Design a binder for this molecule. Structure first.
Ligand SMILES: [Cu+2]
Lengths: 106, 106, 106
């Protein structure tokens, strides 16, 4: 999918995590977020459509999605241990990263 | 080593997993698979040897290895919780991803 | 930060881990190491300043940080389970990888 639709997916699943009731729901949401972030890593965001795929700006963009992938992993590790509240709290900081990426690259 | 050699190492450790009985064996084989996949991630596969290093095709190649690494991680997580049967089933799916990448870029 | 500064952060936190008392300190140092490795993926070593950002040499450089990141992940997973001694042993092997990367690219 294109970058904007991947970003929609990330936001939708953040809402899911915020309102989630059990560890299975959080883990499902976070797995969908990981897939969307990995797919967005192959995309070009609107702000960088005037940059080449191997420009420093596009390399920095892809590293930004690596960073997000590791933050998703932290929440997912919490959810695998049954720590639903701690995973939701970790997802609070995912929202910060996602919002900043939206503002930076749209 | 060679990209082709790394694909071979992935398959040898996949068989090792499928014939395993305890979680430590599966973890060992998955760790070797992770190392092979990271070593292959920096390669130029045969199909892409005529393309610029800056080509989008090479970026998609490397992000495909990131997808494989996260699948390896999920199998490793299952093994590190002693769920050796679930880990073996996840590694049967890894056979698909690994050999699909092999066949895509050879 | 530039590349040498990130590598300094990695080494300072390896020392913190080597001397650490409890899991909280180990985990904090390991999360700083992860952030430094990811940030270093956006840097360029001086001797590679004349190469394409997607050149095989620069790919090798960034993937070397991916190798470090997955080793950091293993140590951080151990630390999150209270396995302080195992995390410190894994950090001792992190030092070898860090120093090899340093020697290769400085
Ligand atoms: Cu993990």
């Amino acid at each position: 999918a294109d970058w904007e639709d991947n970003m929609e997916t990330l936001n939708d699943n953040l809402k899911v995590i915020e309102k989630a009731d059990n560890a299975a729901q959080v883990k499902d949401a976070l797995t969908k977020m990981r897939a969307a972030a990995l797919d967005a890593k192959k995309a070009t965001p609107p702000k960088l459509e005037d940059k080449s795929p191997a420009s420093p700006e596009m390399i920095d963009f892809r590293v930004g999605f690596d960073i997000l992938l590791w933050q998703i992993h932290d929440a997912l590790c919490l959810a695998n241990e049954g720590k639903v509240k701690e995973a939701q709290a970790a997802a609070e900081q995912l929202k910060t990263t996602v919002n900043a990426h939206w503002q930076k690259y749209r």
